[PDB]
Amino acid sequence: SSASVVFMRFAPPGEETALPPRRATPGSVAYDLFPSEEMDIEPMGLAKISTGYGIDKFPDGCYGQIVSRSGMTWKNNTSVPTGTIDVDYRGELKVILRNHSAEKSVPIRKGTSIAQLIFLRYCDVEEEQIVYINETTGERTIIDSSSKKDNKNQARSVRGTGGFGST
Amino acid sequence: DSSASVVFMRFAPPGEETALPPRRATPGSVAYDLFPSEEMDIEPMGLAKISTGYGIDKFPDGCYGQIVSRSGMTWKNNTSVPTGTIDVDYRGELKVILRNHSAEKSVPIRKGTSIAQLIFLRYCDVEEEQIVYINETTGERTIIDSSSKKDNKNQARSVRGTGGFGSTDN
Amino acid sequence: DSSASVVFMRFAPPGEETALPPRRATPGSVAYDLFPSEEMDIEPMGLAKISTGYGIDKFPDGCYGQIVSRSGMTWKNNTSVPTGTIDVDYRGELKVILRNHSAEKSVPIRKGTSIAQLIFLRYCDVEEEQIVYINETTGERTIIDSSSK
Ligand SMILES: O=c1ccn([C@H]2C[C@H](O)[C@@H](CO)O2)c(=O)[nH]1
Ligand SMILES: O=c1ccn([C@H]2C[C@H](O)[C@@H](CO)O2)c(=O)[nH]1
Ligand SMILES: O=c1ccn([C@H]2C[C@H](O)[C@@H](CO)O2)c(=O)[nH]1
Ligand SMILES: [Mg+2]
Ligand SMILES: [Mg+2]
Numbered sequence: 249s250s251a252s253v254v255f256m257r258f259a260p261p262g263e264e265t266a267l268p269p270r271r272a273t274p275g276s277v278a279y280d281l282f283p284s285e286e287m288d289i290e291p292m293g294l295a296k297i298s299t300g301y302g303i304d305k306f307p308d309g310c311y312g313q314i315v316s317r318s319g320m321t322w323k324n325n326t327s328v329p330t331g332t333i334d335v336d337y338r339g340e341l342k343v344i345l346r347n348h349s350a351e352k353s354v355p356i357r358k359g360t361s362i363a364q365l366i367f368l369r370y371c372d373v374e375e376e377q378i379v380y381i382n383e384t385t386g387e388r389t390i391i392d393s394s395s396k397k398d399n400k401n402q403a404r405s406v407r408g409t410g411g412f413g414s415t
Numbered sequence: 416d417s418s419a420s421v422v423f424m425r426f427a428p429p430g431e432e433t434a435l436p437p438r439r440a441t442p443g444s445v446a447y448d449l450f451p452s453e454e455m456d457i458e459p460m461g462l463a464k465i466s467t468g469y470g471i472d473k474f475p476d477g478c479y480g481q482i483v484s485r486s487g488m489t490w491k492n493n494t495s496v497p498t499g500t501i502d503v504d505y506r507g508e509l510k511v512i513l514r515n516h517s518a519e520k521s522v523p524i525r526k527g528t529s530i531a532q533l534i535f536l537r538y539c540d541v542e543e544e545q546i547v548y549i550n551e552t553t554g555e556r557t558i559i560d561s562s563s564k565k566d567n568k569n570q571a572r573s574v575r576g577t578g579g580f581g582s583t584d585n
Numbered sequence: 586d587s588s589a590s591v592v593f594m595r596f597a598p599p600g601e602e603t604a605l606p607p608r609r610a611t612p613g614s615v616a617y618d619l620f621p622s623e624e625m626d627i628e629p630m631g632l633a634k635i636s637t638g639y640g641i642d643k644f645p646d647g648c649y650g651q652i653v654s655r656s657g658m659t660w661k662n663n664t665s666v667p668t669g670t671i672d673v674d675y676r677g678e679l680k681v682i683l684r685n686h687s688a689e690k691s692v693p694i695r696k697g698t699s700i701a702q703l704i705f706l707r708y709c710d711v712e713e714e715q716i717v718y719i720n721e722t723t724g725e726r727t728i729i730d731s732s733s734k
Contacts, residue, residue, distance in 0.1 A: 251542040256549050257559055268546055268560070270569035272583040275504020277479040277538055280583070292688070294663060304547060307539035311615040311704075316498040319581015322512060325462055327497035329666075330659040332702065336613020344659060346686065348514065350460070360584055364500065366479075369537035369707040370615055371645040374589035378606055379642055380599050391595055392606070401608035413657015415610040415618075415699075419712035424719050425729055436716055436730070443674020445649040445708055472717055475709040484668045489682060493632055495667035516684065518630070532670065534649075537707040 253367065254305035258340050266300030267358065269365060278315065280361035281343055289326075289347040289354035296412070297343040297362055306335050310367040314343060317364050325349045328363045335372075339409035341365065372396070421535065422473035426508050427452075434468030434526065437533060446483065446532035449511055457494075457515040457522035464580075465511040465530055474503050478535040482511060485532055493517040496531050503540075507577035509533070540564075591705065592643035596678050597622075604638030605696065607703060616653065616702035619681055627664075627685040627692035635681040635700055644673050648705040652681060655702050663687040666701050673710075679703070710734070 259265035269279035284300040303312055314331025321327060325348045333341065343363045347354045356362060378391040394400040403415035427433035437447035452468035471480055482499025489495060493516045501509065511531045515522045524530060546559040562568040571583035597603035607617035622638040641650055652669025659665065665684045681701045685692045694700060716729040 249543060251539055253539075253541050253544045255544070255546045257546055259548075261548055261557055261559060268569065271541075272571040273502065273504055273575040274564070274567065274570070274573065275575055276502050277540070278500060278502075292686075294660065294686070296660065301546075304549065307541060309707075310539045315500050317581065318498045318500070318512065318579060319584050321498040322462065322464060322580055327495070327514070327665065329664070330654040330656045332616060332653055332656070332704070334611065334613050334615050336611055344656065346665070348460075348462075366500065367539040367541065369539065371589055371648045371705040371707065372615070373591050373609075373645060373705065375586070376590065377592045378595050378639075379592055380595045380597075381642065389599055391599060396612075399612055401606065402612075403610035405612065407611045407613055411656060412660050413655065415657075416713070419709060420714065421711050422715045422717055424717050429718055429727060429729065439711075441672065441674060442734075443672045445672050445710070446670060469716075472719065475711060478709045483670050486668045486670070486682070489668040490632070490634060495665065495684070516630075516632070534670070535709040535711065537709065 250308050253307055256302045256304040258300055269301060278364035278366040281341060281363050281365055282361050283356050283358060286358060287356045289345060291347060291349050291351055291353060293347045295345050297345060297356060299341045299343060302340050307367050309369050311335050311370050313366050313368050314363050315366060317361060320362060324354045326354055334407055336407040339411055418476045421475055424470045424472040426468055437469055446534040448529035449531045449533055451524050451526060451530055454526060455524045457513060459515060459518050459520060461515045463513050465513060465524060467509040467511060470508050475535050477537050479503050479538050481534050481536050482531050483534060485529055488530060492522050494522055502575060504575040505579060507579055588646045591645055594640045594642040596638055607639055616704045618699035619701050619703055621694045621696060621700055624696055625694045627683060629685060629688050629690060631685045633683050635683060635694060637679045637681060640678050645705050647707050649673050649708050651704050651706050652701050653704060655699055658700060662692045664692060
């Protein structure tokens with residue numbers, strides 16, 4: 249089960265919630281996220297929209313990146329300015345959507361997907377070093393070095409449901 | 416070898432003028448410079464959809480195409496590329512979405528100057544998925560749904576074709 | 586082992602005060618927090634190029650560096666990081682491009698607060714490429730060009 253994902257639905261079974269993440273076509277690279285509640289983003293506004301789902305299990309070597317959908321961007325003059333989901337995040341996925349229109353509001357509706365989640369491959373660094381390289385001599389001075397187990401320069405040990413500048 | 420190869424498809428017939436082909440500027444460049452097929456001026460606070468003249472016929476194995484902004488275009492012209500996720504079943508022409516954040520200046524779009532860059536990023540094409548409800552108090556896990564890629568769960572349509580830019584929205 | 590190791594290069598000499606080093610905030614954090622070398626206030630609707638004090642001497646195998654926005658700086662300060670693609674031959678100092686989307690408020694850039702984050706993303710360094718023309722009506726394929734890295 250290498251190319252597998254487990255989404256966690258925050259609402260109990262039988263309770264009403266957002267439409268589940270879905271892949272629009274067989275070659276779609278991302279899951280369309282839907283809003284749990286409806287709203288209208290005011291001109292020049294910034295919204296944090298709940299999707300009703302979290303990620304219980306990520307595919308191996310991947311993290312989740314929320315990116316904009318081209319239709320929502322172009323037709324509604326928006327952007328998704330952030331969307332990096334850490335692999336220890338246990339909370340609900342929230343979409344940050346910016347309205348760039350000075351006169352029009354953006355409709356957020358239950359049947360229409362607001363952004364998409366892609367599972368990107370990244371390197372979870374095991375070893376790191378900070379070096380100083382002398383521009384004139386070429387001499388390398390090791391300033392510091394750490395292994396992932398060292399948990400050096402850490403904000404906290406457990407992310408939990410903490411996000412949005414929680415560190 | 417499909418693992419490290421790409422095939423771009425040119426939309427204009429061979430005996431016709433078109434955009435400069437996607438190309439990597441340096442040996443360490445991670446992305447292909449994209450060029451416009453036609454010229455325009457993006458008005459202050461404007462948003463443009465620019466034709467590049469090319470599509471992707473074949474992606475490198477396990478990769479998709481991500482259109483990202485160029486640092487020069489972003490900084491010198493006060494722009495952004497607010498979207499750029501290319502699906503591996505997309506058969507249409509790549510279009511660059513460029514936003515002008517300047518209130519006073521227009522952005523010049525010219526044939527010899529690159530407007531964005533395209534990176535082939537490694538992603539997971541999910542084969543098996545589950546939706547679960549986790550009750551941490553009872554230590555229980557209720558499977559709401561499960562699907563394999565071939566189940567085509569909650570799909571909009573079978574063939575993407577040349578459809579993009581909200582083609583799956585109502 | 587080059588497969589999961591990184592070497593950051595500090596631009597300031599060792600006896601000099603500089604930006605806080607790139608750090609992963611929690612054990613599950615996928616990105617390194619970047620900090621400013623100097624303090625500033627980004628004017629309303631402004632765009633800043635902020636020095637971080639560090640470059641990348643060595644990238645993990647098959648990875649490049651992508652500077653992306655932090656959700657706190659985006660949401661609390663009404664910003665975006667509109668660019669951040671670091672090429673694997675880049676020997677300069679990483680600079681964060683931060684846009685202020687507010688019309689009335691300035692963005693404070695302070696030494697102890699991270700301004701963006703750096704992810705080591707896996708990408709394909711293409712070895713072979715072709716440009717083809719596909720005749721929609723006939724299905725015939727004409728190779729326009731082909732090149733190896
Ligand atoms: O667009 C975003 C950005 C972040 N987060 C969550 C997950 C992430 O690990 C944490 C802090 O970045 O907040 C979201 O829900 N959506
Ligand atoms: O910036 C973008 C975003 C999308 N698309 C196309 C390809 C993609 O698979 C489809 C649906 O987003 O639209 C582009 O050409 N450029
Ligand atoms: O946000 C950015 C984008 C680019 N660069 C550097 C590295 C890259 O290889 C070069 C050209 O894009 O400029 C930065 O320092 N910061
Ligand atoms: Mg889509
Ligand atoms: Mg963080």
